[PDB]
């Protein structure tokens, strides 16, 4: 019996070397019972023509196996794809030795394709090891919009997530495009200092140019990419002191061919000891069904662990990839890559050439940079947030309190009463009051500088589906925090489960609850009045949409009927509902205690009712990761034992 083994080459030398490798396999095992023969074809620039050649040459003979390598010209990186589909039509195994694209790594489209070298996406694995090397956490991902980029993104996010770690942020960009600096801008000011990247050679050159002209090569900053991003023009545009990743066997196609022939010989010899061996179809025309041992061959080739590899023991993974990879890490010192480490299958050992980081140092810098300048988001609420337009000088007329001290007024930028009727021109008005007072107190306590501005949309925000019932996301300040537009939530906000499910809160700086306002028997009996226990059309009652009480009424399923009334009359702010009640347009308004008794004690034309049925706290809520949590908690607790907010209450809410 004679078995044909196919190769796709265009060297005219590795072809004869492949024939010699077939002869070597025969020498190693013997072809007396089962003769072995070789066949070589030449991949052509025209994909249709080369596919036709494969069909009418490699299928015209009952060839059991086929391999392929990349051409020298970088044109048509997906040259094996027609060969892969040709093999797939009869479900034939195929080997690609030189491909680094995760496109071929898919087995839904490429059933029996096997690749010796893992793609660039598997490169991700070493970065994780890099993270273990330097004990870093503040990872920023930058990646192209190509499928390879998304696959690498998924692999690396998986790798970082089994260690209960998460990337600080991810950025996607369109390959081949420019003006990436703007994207870099919105990634420039983040507290992280270690960077990862995935792109193509030209894209790598573009981002290198941008970073160089953006002074991103300074101290603290550092990043790592693959081989194609540190080659040719990309290497030309790369800065010095940059670290790089290298294959142990990047360019020796001959070694790949040798190991491939060896593993093919092992697999076929394991096959020939079995029965029911079906010959591959002879000629595309006349055969239109599946080959039977094809899937069998792939099953026994997953299990094929080829020890006699020139590059070592070749063990395929679950997906036909060489496990325990052999890499190296170089440093680009003075336009040359110099050895700084060797990556054995799971870890790295350094040897020499201590890493000269791009900032000009040789000692390892922390991949983080704490920011004293912090972002502050707020919402208008008169008892806690007084907002007033500034006059011509850029500020507003400051005035002194009854005690004689001036009120501290910060520059808060608001889109000119944000609304459809607003021009959305974000004028810097002045904000002052309770919350601003406690911010400046705790700020001078922690010495950190601050930037204050209220929320854009003026709404609290709730977990809502994206437009057409797509995934859930946060609105308002929670939206800007899960996106990073701000750092803490400084407002009389209501603590709850879902916010705590995504954000965290300190100890509440204020204790409060819920109550109702009406005008001026007919006393609405708190919450237990059938006027509200049973929803009634003649009676109007509502709150602000996308607020905490919305979640309250949503979780209280038995109260859903009143929630049904909510859908008709929900307001957007407090002042207009207050006017409506004063105009008797709204019969009753449910809202938070503190603001409400403040308004009642000030205006006296409206009356509050109902006890604080929902005990709750106004606390500083902010991100789980940042370290200020405990610091701010202990600071506000110290102020509480100092009665500082008691003085603030005397200043703002009491004496009215």
């Amino acid at each position: 019996k004679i078995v044909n083994i196919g190769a796709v080459l265009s060297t005219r030398k590795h072809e004869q070397m492949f024939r010699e490798a077939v002869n070597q396999a025969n020498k190693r095992h013997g072809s007396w019972k089962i003769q072995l023969n070789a066949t070589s074809v030449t991949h052509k620039p025209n994909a249709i023509q080369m596919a036709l050649s494969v069909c009418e040459d490699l299928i015209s003979s009952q060839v059991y196996a086929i391999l392929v390598s990349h051409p020298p010209t970088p044109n048509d990186h997906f040259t094996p794809t027609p060969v892969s589909y040709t093999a797939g039509f009869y479900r034939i195994p195929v080997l690609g030795l030189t491909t680094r694209m995760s496109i071929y790594s898919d087995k839904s489209i490429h059933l029996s394709f096997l690749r010796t070298v893992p793609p660039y996406s598997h490169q991700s694995s070493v970065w994780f090891e890099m993270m273990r090397v330097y004990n870093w956490n503040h990872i920023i991902l930058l990646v192209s919009d190509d499928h390879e980029g998304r696959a690498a993104q998924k692999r690396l996010e998986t790798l970082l997530e089994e260690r209960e770690s998460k990337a600080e942020k991810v950025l996607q960009f369109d390959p081949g495009t420019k003006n990436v600096t703007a994207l870099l801008m919105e990634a420039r000011e983040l507290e992280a200092r270690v960077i990862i990247l995935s792109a193509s050679e030209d894209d790598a050159a573009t981002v290198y140019r941008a970073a160089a002209m953006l002074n991103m090569t300074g101290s603290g900053y550092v990043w790592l990419v693959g081989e194609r991003e540190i080659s040719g023009n990309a290497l030309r545009y790369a800065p010095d002191g940059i670290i790089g990743l290298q294959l142990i066997n990047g360019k020796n196609e001959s070694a790949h061919i040798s190991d491939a022939v060896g593993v093919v010989a092992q697999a076929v010899h394991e096959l020939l000891e079995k029965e029911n061996i079906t010959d591959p179809p002879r000629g595309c025309v006349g055969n239109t069904n599946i080959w039977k041992t094809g899937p069998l061959f792939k099953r026994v080739l997953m299990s094929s662990k080829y020890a006699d590899g020139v590059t070592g023991r070749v063990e395929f993974n679950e997906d036909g990839d060489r496990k325990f990879a052999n890499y190296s890490i170089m440093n680009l010192q003075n336009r040359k890559l110099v050895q700084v480490g060797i990556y054995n299958g799971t870890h790295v050992i350094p040897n020499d050439r201590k890493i000269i980081w791009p900032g000009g140092e040789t000692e390892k810098p922390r991949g983080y940079q704490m920011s004293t300048r912090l972002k502050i988001v707020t919402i208008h609420q008169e008892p806690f947030v007084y907002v007033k337009p500034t006059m011509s000088d850029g500020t507003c007329k400051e005035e002194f309190t009854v005690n004689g001290d001036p009120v501290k007024k910060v520059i808060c930028t608001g889109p000119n009463d944000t609304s459809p009727g607003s021009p959305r021109h974000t004028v810097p008005q002045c904000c002052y009051g309770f919350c601003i007072d406690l911010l400046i107190k705790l700020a001078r306590t922690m010495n950190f500088t601050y930037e204050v501005h209220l929320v854009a949309d003026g709404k609290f925000g709730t977990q809502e589906r994206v437009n057409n019932s797509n995934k859930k996301e946060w609105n308002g300040m929670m939206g800007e925090l899960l996106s990073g537009q701000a750092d803490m939530i400084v407002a009389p906000l209501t603590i709850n489960n879902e916010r705590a499910q995504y954000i965290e809160f300190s100890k509440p700086f204020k204790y409060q609850g819920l109550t109702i306002l009406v005008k001026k028997e007919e006393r609405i009996t708190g919450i237990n009045d059938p006027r509200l226990r049973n929803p009634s059309d003649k009676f109007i009652y509502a709150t602000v949409k996308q607020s905490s009480v919305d979640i309250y009424f949503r979780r209280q399923v038995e109260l859903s009927t009143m929630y049904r009334h909510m859908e008709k009359h929900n307001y957007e702010s407090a002042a207009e509902a207050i006017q409506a009640v004063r105009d008797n347009k709204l019969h009753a308004f449910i809202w938070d205690s503190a603001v409400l008794e403040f308004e009642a004690s000030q205006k006296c034309d409206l009356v509050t009712t109902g006890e604080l049925f929902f005990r709750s706290g106004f606390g500083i809520g902010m991100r789980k990761d940042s370290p200020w949590k405990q610091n701010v908690s202990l600071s506000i607790l110290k102020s509480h034992e100092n009665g500082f907010m008691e003085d603030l209450d005397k200043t703002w809410v009491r004496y009215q």
Partner: protein
């Protein structure tokens, strides 16, 4: 499951004995579907008190349900599943024609046809993705055929069909894009051959 030719039944049947669900959802090929239906037949999990679900992939010809297929199986397909091939061809030709006519309405020109096989054009011929965009939104006979950015049909109107008590595949309900309809507010659990049982 392995479900390949000559797959070890002990390894599979043992875990099936370890399976205790009354309601199931499965994924496999049509040949794998036949194999697992036989395997569950000797497993006894085909019984009326058992429910199993499957996508369209493990289904062959709707008009040719193999004997291995058990009674009461249910899935969902396109409404055109009862339309003859001629109707499908006519609808496809109509989709292409209306896309081309929309291209003419926007610009007044026919879509440029493709070239031959001895070369390959590099650029995308901006008229071609203009035609693609006008093909991204298709409506014919009230049935929208607007495709997805993923290269397939998005937001379609589906029909849920179920194998009947006579080993006949018939439609039980319809999913109209936000609404479900279906017959049989209870499922007839035929006594492994016929005669559905009244639940206690």
């Amino acid at each position: 499951l392995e479900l390949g030719p000559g797959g070890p039944r002990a390894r599979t049947q043992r875990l099936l004995r370890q399976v205790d669900a009354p309601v199931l959802v499965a994924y496999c090929s049509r040949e794998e579907a036949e194999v697992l239906f036989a395997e569950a037949a000797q497993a006894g999990l085909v019984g009326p008190g058992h429910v199993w679900l499957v996508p369209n992939l493990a289904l062959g010809s709707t008009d040719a349900p193999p004997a291995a297929f058990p009674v009461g199986l249910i899935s969902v397909v396109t409404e055109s599943w009862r339309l003859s091939l001629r109707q499908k061809v006519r609808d496809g030709v109509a989709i292409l024609a209306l896309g081309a006519h929309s291209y003419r309405r926007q610009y007044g020109t026919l879509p440029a046809p493709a070239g031959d096989c001895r070369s390959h054009p590099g650029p995308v011929s901006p008229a071609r993705e203009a035609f693609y965009r006008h093909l991204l939104n298709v409506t014919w006979e009230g049935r929208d055929f607007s495709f997805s950015p993923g290269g397939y049909l998005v937001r379609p109107t589906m029909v849920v069909i179920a194998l009947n008590r006579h080993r006949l595949w018939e439609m039980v309900g319809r999913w109209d894009h936000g609404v479900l309809y279906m017959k049989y507010p209870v499922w007839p659990r035929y006594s492994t051959s016929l005669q559905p049982v009244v639940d206690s």
